[PDB]
């Protein structure tokens, strides 16, 4: 099993974009932030596009605000590079997209539309589409040698690669103009919508189609996705030591391989390495004899045995991934005895990531 060398990938300035993928709740945001921090410590001018940092982490980075733009993260004077961070504002990115293509005058009408504000901006795939759009904004401004991209949480790891295109095709549906903004079939559908939906809502929906005046959305999603194919892009798949997260990582590795997209490797996060070499069978028996004979030493032995069983499941999970993907470099990150919610804890995480 090949060891993933995140340190060498971060230190090499031919790698311009690092995308942190996988299911939600595996450590993607903290991995992205820790990678970006270490790259700054190696001398790089880095921006990290975070999606959903926990309150404390967002504050540790100075990004707890409503801004939708990078800001410098103040670091120790010894740090030779620069770290910049932001948290994605999904709604504000939709506004910026609307204005870029519709213009500032027309955008005043679209942004004021109740259908846009309540429905259009909260559709399935908006978080993935806006993350891709924001990545596209960061790349066009050519202000950073490295962009570290965090991806939105989902039960499905492929939503990052599929949800923007899917949302684009839905936005470009013929049904928008023909059913809201005559025929026998379109007329029957139109009559049914007028009969069931509220007049106010249909007027707002029709005004959005007329105002927007967009295969616009799919073409945008396609062009932005093409940036992920530029030379210097690296994908990092993050997974917890759980079966659901690993399965999701494998679906993502397959896709990257099919699409000939460069994969750095897998970050197998929250592991429980054994610190004591005592066998499980031995520990269980040693605790069992003490019960029938202080009491602290038996609980201590029970902790160890429980950790060893946990380590055993993690080893067999990883070996199944590794067996199926012998080509994929891997790095095991232990579960740290503190929350990864400050710069000091990001540094300890990055030490694990870069060994």
């Amino acid at each position: 099993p090949k060891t993933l060398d995140m340190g060498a990938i971060l230190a090499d300035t031919s790698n311009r974009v690092v995308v942190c993928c996988g299911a939600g709740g595996v450590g993607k945001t903290t991995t992205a932030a820790a990678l970006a921090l270490r790259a700054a410590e190696y001398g790089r001018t880095v921006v990290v596009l975070t999606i959903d940092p926990a309150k404390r982490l967002a504050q540790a980075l100075g990004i707890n605000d409503l801004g939708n733009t990078p800001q410098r993260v103040p670091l120790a004077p010894e740090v030779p590079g620069e770290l910049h961070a932001m948290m994605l504002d999904m709604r504000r990115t939709f506004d910026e997209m609307v204005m870029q293509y519709s213009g500032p005058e027309r955008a005043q009408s679209i942004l004021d539309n109740q259908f846009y504000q309540t429905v259009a901006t909260s559709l399935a795939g908006t978080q993935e589409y806006m993350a891709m759009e924001k990545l596209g904004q960061l790349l066009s401004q050519d202000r950073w040698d490295l962009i570290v991209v965090d991806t939105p949480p989902s039960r499905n790891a492929l939503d990052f690669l599929d949800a923007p295109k899917r949302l684009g095709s839905f936005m470009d549906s013929r049904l928008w103009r023909l059913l809201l903004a005559i025929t026998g079939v379109m007329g029957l559908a139109m009559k049914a919508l007028s009969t069931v939906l509220g007049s106010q809502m249909l007027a707002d929906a029709a005004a959005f189609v007329q105002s927007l005046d967009a295969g616009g959305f799919r073409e945008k999603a396609d062009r932005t996705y093409a940036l992920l194919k530029r030379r210097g892009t690296q994908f990092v798949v993050v997974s917890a030591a759980e079966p659901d997260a690993l399965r999701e990582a494998s679906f993502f590795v397959d896709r990257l391989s099919q699409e000939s997209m460069p994969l750095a490797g897998l970050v197998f996060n929250r592991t429980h390495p054994m610190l004591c070499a005592l066998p499980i069978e031995r520990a269980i028996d040693a605790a069992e004899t003490l019960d029938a004979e202080t009491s602290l030493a038996a609980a201590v032995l029970r902790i160890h045995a429980e950790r060893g069983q946990t380590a055993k499941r993690e080893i067999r999970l990883l070996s199944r991934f590794t067996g199926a993907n012998p080509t994929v470099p891997v790095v095991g990150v232990p579960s740290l005895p503190f929350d990864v919610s400050d710069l000091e804890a990001l540094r300890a995480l990055a030490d694990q990531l870069t060994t």
């Binding site: 559908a189 069931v196 610190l275 029970r302």
Partner: protein, 330 residues
């Protein structure tokens, strides 16, 4: 103190919410099994089109039909209903507007999918309307078809809006029979016949979302049932020993002594390793207890479910159902 007050046994509609990945689907299925035991008939409902029941029982996708999915203890039955929002919209068009023709034409051009996507209020009206239909349905003997309905519900971030019948109805066509039905939905939801259960993990975000959801729902005068703490782990340490070990203090002498009695002698590098393993465990339990303490402020009954070692399978659902029954769930 009790995790299941008696008033919860008179509830016909159980809504199981909680943050994403906390255990809603698993727990809703375990709850349905618990309520079906003793010759009862319970309906397990899912409303998001995600086919989570089929996935949980490891079967192909379920059609829009109430079908027997499990046998409960002593001749009980659990039926499954994976609501198909498209078929529900056509059903609604046909029953309330006699637009079955227009509806079948719409399905052929993807217009039902469009309409339910672009009008979230219509989606909730169809979903909550179908939920109400299964609850109030009667047999030939004017007795309820189901003893209870368990809804594997939307998550904590969406549960209050999903149950906001007034806001859902707001952007629908004025007049007709849809407004008379919605009054019945509100009455059912704001009654002793309904209870919203909130699944949580002993983690910061699932607990914050639980507290925030309870506050939105209480403001809406919606009935709260229980907070269900999923995937509990053993502390395996006494409160004083645990509090000490969370600070790095473990009594090596006392540990070395107890290891001699058990016929185990450990090298210095392995003994030190064994101690930091217990410090790391103690630190996790302590942090989990600090998080759990935030729920103590709620004068809400609490249930606790253990962690299933291997992948949650059919046998696991029965273990969790059994764990619920032991806590008074009936």
């Amino acid at each position: 103190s009790v995790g299941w007050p008696s008033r919860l046994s008179g509830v016909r509609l159980h809504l199981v919410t909680g943050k994403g990945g906390t255990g809603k689907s698993t727990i809703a299925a375990a709850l349905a099994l618990t309520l079906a035991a003793g010759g009862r008939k319970v309906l397990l409902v899912e409303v998001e089109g995600r086919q989570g029941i089929a996935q949980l029982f490891d079967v192909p996708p379920l059609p829009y039909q109430e079908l027997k999915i499990a046998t409960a203890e002593r001749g009980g039955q659990v039926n499954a209903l994976a609501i198909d929002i498209e078929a529900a919209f056509l059903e609604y068009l046909d029953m309330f507007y006699n637009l079955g023709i227009a509806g079948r034409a719409m399905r052929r051009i993807g217009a039902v999918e469009f309409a339910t996507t672009i009008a979230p209020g219509l989606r909730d009206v169809l979903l909550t309307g179908k939920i109400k239909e299964t609850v109030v349905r009667l047999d030939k003997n004017k007795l309820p078809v189901y003893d209870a309905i368990v809804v594997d519900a939307p998550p904590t971030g969406r549960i209050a809006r999903f149950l906001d019948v007034t806001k859902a109805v707001s952007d629908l066509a004025k007049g007709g029979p849809v407004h008379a039905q919605s009054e019945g939905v509100v009455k059912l939801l704001h009654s002793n016949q309904t209870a919203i259960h909130l699944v949580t993990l002993l983690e910061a975000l699932p607990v914050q979302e639980t507290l925030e959801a309870i506050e939105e729902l209480a403001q809406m005068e919606l009935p709260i049932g229980s907070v269900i703490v999923n995937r509990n782990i053993p502390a395996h340490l006494e409160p004083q020993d645990l509090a000490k070990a969370a600070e790095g203090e473990v009594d090596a002498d006392s540990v070395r002594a107890g290891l001699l009695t058990a016929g185990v002698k450990l090298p210095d590098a392995d003994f030190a390793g064994l101690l930091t393993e217990t410090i790391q465990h103690a630190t996790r339990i302590t942090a989990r207890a600090e998080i759990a303490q935030q729920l103590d402020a709620l004068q809400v009954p609490r249930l606790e479910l253990p962690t299933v070692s291997d992948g949650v399978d059919l046998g696991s659902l029965y273990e969790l159902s059994e764990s619920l029954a032991q806590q008074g769930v009936r």
